[PDB]
Design an enzyme around this catalytic site. Sequence first.
Site, PDB file in Angstrom:
ATOM      1  N   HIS A  62      69.089  59.892  33.231  1.00 57.02           N
ATOM      2  CA  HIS A  62      68.032  60.108  34.201  1.00 57.02           C
ATOM      3  C   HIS A  62      67.904  58.965  35.205  1.00 57.02           C
ATOM      4  CE1 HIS A  62      66.289  57.907  30.879  1.00 57.02           C
ATOM      5  NE2 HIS A  62      65.248  57.583  31.625  1.00 57.02           N
ATOM      6  N   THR A 109      69.758  59.179  40.299  1.00 59.31           N
ATOM      7  CA  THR A 109      71.049  58.874  40.899  1.00 59.31           C
ATOM      8  C   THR A 109      72.014  57.992  40.146  1.00 59.31           C
ATOM      9  OG1 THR A 109      69.883  57.153  42.138  1.00 59.31           O
ATOM     10  CG2 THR A 109      70.255  59.270  43.255  1.00 59.31           C
ATOM     11  N   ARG A 110      73.292  58.200  40.443  1.00 57.38           N
ATOM     12  CA  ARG A 110      74.363  57.446  39.830  1.00 57.38           C
ATOM     13  C   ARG A 110      75.450  57.150  40.865  1.00 57.38           C
ATOM     14  NH1 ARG A 110      71.110  57.335  36.456  1.00 57.38           N
ATOM     15  NH2 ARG A 110      71.259  57.449  34.171  1.00 57.38           N
ATOM     16  N   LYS A 124      66.597  51.859  45.399  1.00 53.87           N
ATOM     17  CA  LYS A 124      66.575  51.759  43.948  1.00 53.87           C
ATOM     18  C   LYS A 124      67.509  50.637  43.529  1.00 53.87           C
ATOM     19  CE  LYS A 124      68.374  54.314  39.970  1.00 53.87           C
ATOM     20  NZ  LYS A 124      69.115  55.567  39.660  1.00 53.87           N
ATOM     21  N   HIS A 150      72.409  44.987  36.019  1.00 53.75           N
ATOM     22  CA  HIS A 150      73.457  45.488  35.128  1.00 53.75           C
ATOM     23  C   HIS A 150      73.863  44.659  33.909  1.00 53.75           C
ATOM     24  CE1 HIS A 150      76.789  48.187  34.268  1.00 53.75           C
ATOM     25  NE2 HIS A 150      77.720  47.306  34.583  1.00 53.75           N
ATOM     26  N   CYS A 188      66.243  53.469  30.730  1.00 55.54           N
ATOM     27  CA  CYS A 188      67.331  54.272  30.227  1.00 55.54           C
ATOM     28  C   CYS A 188      68.237  53.397  29.368  1.00 55.54           C
ATOM     29  CB  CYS A 188      67.996  54.923  31.451  1.00 55.54           C
ATOM     30  SG  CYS A 188      69.783  55.153  31.462  1.00 55.54           S
ATOM     31  N   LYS A 216      79.840  58.534  36.406  1.00 55.49           N
ATOM     32  CA  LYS A 216      80.744  58.943  37.480  1.00 55.49           C
ATOM     33  C   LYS A 216      81.982  59.667  36.957  1.00 55.49           C
ATOM     34  CE  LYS A 216      81.101  54.579  38.550  1.00 55.49           C
ATOM     35  NZ  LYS A 216      80.693  53.861  37.280  1.00 55.49           N
TER      36      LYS A 216
HETATM   37  C1  LIG Z   1      71.068  53.934  31.817  1.00 51.89           C
HETATM   38  C2  LIG Z   1      71.799  53.750  33.018  1.00 51.89           C
HETATM   39  C3  LIG Z   1      73.088  54.181  32.961  1.00 51.89           C
HETATM   40  C4  LIG Z   1      73.874  54.207  34.123  1.00 51.89           C
HETATM   41  C5  LIG Z   1      73.299  53.792  35.378  1.00 51.89           C
HETATM   42  C6  LIG Z   1      71.935  53.314  35.416  1.00 51.89           C
HETATM   43  C7  LIG Z   1      71.180  53.278  34.251  1.00 51.89           C
HETATM   44  C8  LIG Z   1      69.756  52.775  34.285  1.00 51.89           C
HETATM   45  N1  LIG Z   1      73.977  53.855  36.581  1.00 51.89           N
HETATM   46  C9  LIG Z   1      75.253  54.352  36.503  1.00 51.89           C
HETATM   47  C10 LIG Z   1      75.923  54.470  37.733  1.00 51.89           C
HETATM   48  O1  LIG Z   1      75.444  54.168  38.838  1.00 51.89           O
HETATM   49  N2  LIG Z   1      77.254  55.000  37.654  1.00 51.89           N
HETATM   50  C11 LIG Z   1      77.912  55.389  36.476  1.00 51.89           C
HETATM   51  O2  LIG Z   1      79.040  55.834  36.486  1.00 51.89           O
HETATM   52  N3  LIG Z   1      77.205  55.247  35.324  1.00 51.89           N
HETATM   53  C12 LIG Z   1      75.952  54.761  35.340  1.00 51.89           C
HETATM   54  N4  LIG Z   1      75.237  54.671  34.122  1.00 51.89           N
HETATM   55  C13 LIG Z   1      75.972  55.009  32.808  1.00 51.89           C
HETATM   56  C14 LIG Z   1      75.977  56.513  32.546  1.00 51.89           C
HETATM   57  O3  LIG Z   1      74.654  57.078  32.923  1.00 51.89           O
HETATM   58  C15 LIG Z   1      76.179  56.614  31.009  1.00 51.89           C
HETATM   59  O4  LIG Z   1      77.398  56.036  30.634  1.00 51.89           O
HETATM   60  C16 LIG Z   1      76.202  58.250  30.659  1.00 51.89           C
HETATM   61  O5  LIG Z   1      75.098  58.923  31.034  1.00 51.89           O
HETATM   62  C17 LIG Z   1      76.633  58.296  29.233  1.00 51.89           C
HETATM   63  O6  LIG Z   1      76.641  59.751  28.900  1.00 51.89           O
HETATM   64  P1  LIG Z   1      76.567  60.308  27.414  1.00 51.89           P
HETATM   65  O7  LIG Z   1      76.828  61.703  27.483  1.00 51.89           O
HETATM   66  O8  LIG Z   1      77.221  59.340  26.536  1.00 51.89           O
HETATM   67  O9  LIG Z   1      74.944  60.005  27.064  1.00 51.89           O
HETATM   68  P2  LIG Z   1      73.683  61.060  27.424  1.00 51.89           P
HETATM   69  O10 LIG Z   1      73.843  61.524  28.777  1.00 51.89           O
HETATM   70  O11 LIG Z   1      72.516  60.229  26.951  1.00 51.89           O
HETATM   71  O12 LIG Z   1      73.929  62.201  26.435  1.00 51.89           O
HETATM   72  C18 LIG Z   1      73.827  62.126  24.987  1.00 51.89           C
HETATM   73  C19 LIG Z   1      73.064  63.334  24.559  1.00 51.89           C
HETATM   74  O13 LIG Z   1      73.207  63.579  23.154  1.00 51.89           O
HETATM   75  C20 LIG Z   1      71.971  63.897  22.566  1.00 51.89           C
HETATM   76  N5  LIG Z   1      71.780  63.607  21.182  1.00 51.89           N
HETATM   77  C21 LIG Z   1      71.575  62.372  20.649  1.00 51.89           C
HETATM   78  N6  LIG Z   1      71.495  62.370  19.360  1.00 51.89           N
HETATM   79  C22 LIG Z   1      71.657  63.677  19.003  1.00 51.89           C
HETATM   80  C23 LIG Z   1      71.676  64.359  17.748  1.00 51.89           C
HETATM   81  N7  LIG Z   1      71.515  63.698  16.581  1.00 51.89           N
HETATM   82  N8  LIG Z   1      71.859  65.714  17.724  1.00 51.89           N
HETATM   83  C24 LIG Z   1      72.017  66.374  18.902  1.00 51.89           C
HETATM   84  N9  LIG Z   1      72.014  65.795  20.154  1.00 51.89           N
HETATM   85  C25 LIG Z   1      71.827  64.441  20.117  1.00 51.89           C
HETATM   86  C26 LIG Z   1      70.853  63.401  23.529  1.00 51.89           C
HETATM   87  O14 LIG Z   1      69.603  64.098  23.474  1.00 51.89           O
HETATM   88  C27 LIG Z   1      71.551  63.323  24.870  1.00 51.89           C
HETATM   89  O15 LIG Z   1      71.164  64.450  25.642  1.00 51.89           O
END
Ligand SMILES: *Cc1cc2c(cc1C)nc1c(=O)[nH]c(=O)nc-1n2C[C@H](O)[C@H](O)[C@H](O)COP(=O)(O)OP(=O)(O)OC[C@H]1O[C@@H](n2cnc3c(N)ncnc32)[C@H](O)[C@@H]1O
Length: 385
Positions: free
Chosen positions: A45, A48-49, A265, A269, A315, A348
Amino acid sequence: STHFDVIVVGAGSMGMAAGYQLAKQGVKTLLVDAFDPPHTNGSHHGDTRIIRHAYGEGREYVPLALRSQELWYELEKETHHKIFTKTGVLVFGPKGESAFVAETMEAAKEHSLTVDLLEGDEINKRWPGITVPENYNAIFEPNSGVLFSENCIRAYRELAEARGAKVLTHTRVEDFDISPDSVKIETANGSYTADKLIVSMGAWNSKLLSKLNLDIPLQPYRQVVGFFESDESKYSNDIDFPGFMVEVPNGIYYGFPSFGGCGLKLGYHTFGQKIDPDTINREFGVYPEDESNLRAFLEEYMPGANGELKRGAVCMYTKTLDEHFIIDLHPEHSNVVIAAGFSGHGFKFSSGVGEVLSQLALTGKTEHDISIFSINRPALKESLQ
Ligand SMILES: *Cc1cc2c(cc1C)nc1c(=O)[nH]c(=O)nc-1n2C[C@H](O)[C@H](O)[C@H](O)COP(=O)(O)OP(=O)(O)OC[C@H]1O[C@@H](n2cnc3c(N)ncnc32)[C@H](O)[C@@H]1O
Ligand SMILES: [Cl-]
Ligand SMILES: [Te]
């Protein structure tokens, strides 16, 4: 009573992309998420990314970045949701004092990427609103940009479901049962089986991979971002202020131009609090560093974008020891695919990773070179219980 071809646990950035790729091929898929994606409890969330092509973390990421960019352009054409804006991305730092800037430059040269090199006052002149010392240099990438991450996941989900993928929300997977010819997950709302399993639980990979007999160092970090009232005549996307990722003496910061006047924003990092995804405090401002680390950068480098705090978000990053991702088959189960440790820079690539995960789950292989993300690499310090 319902078996699936593939089950994706964790339908976030990586999982939903995989779900889309699988569903598009007629693969009967089940995506299970602890919440309702896109949401604000994971790592996707904050609206933006940044997507960069010339990659400071390592030139070896360029191919996946380029393929991902192509997939983002494809997604844009397939949904009514806004996916990408070509703000371009500026990378700068002290001349001769940034491995990040240097590798970005080498990456651009090595893959013949289109970039502009400039330094000192030229930076401040080209982008009114930026004030860097004269000893700073920069590499600007005009065709890179900004992804609307929540929109991306929402689009991938809507397109996947339209094709038959099922998404089970607010359901936390608590354990797994893997056999040589099938996989099974256990949740409070029931258990499910399939031929293949994709595991992409983001920050929760650090707590639940042990259920798959995996012992891999993965540390979740609390990472905040702030939106600030800014001088729109300088920091608006409309006047071409770029997205950016830069290195200064005390670390790396990244930011985005103001979109529709919502404010510039910014995020710090290289620093974050080590946390546990189930006890992290998701309120912005509870730590004094949340806001002060950001203004320390703005008052010095982008003084016109240091107004009132309009919004804050909290996040998580999930880091590996070498800060490179983990994308590979489980070492003991070729029918289990792992996507973890994106270490704060994986969004990304999510479109490309979705494609890789789909290929790994369906064929046990992928056309992409993913050796640098091997779950068996020594720098990772991977082990089994
Ligand atoms: C946090 C952050 C990250 C970030 C960024 C700025 C911030 C503040 N800016 C970025 C940027 O400009 N460019 C870029 O390429 N990356 C940037 N990032 C990193 C990127 O957002 C993260 O690497 C990415 O989102 C990682 O994705 P992933 O798929 O690993 O993580 P998620 O999106 O959180 O999804 C995980 C999902 O799984 C679910 N979940 C968790 N536990 C369970 C269980 N037990 N059972 C079922 N589902 C589960 C979560 O609910 C979640 O939806
Ligand atoms: Cl991450
Ligand atoms: Te706004």
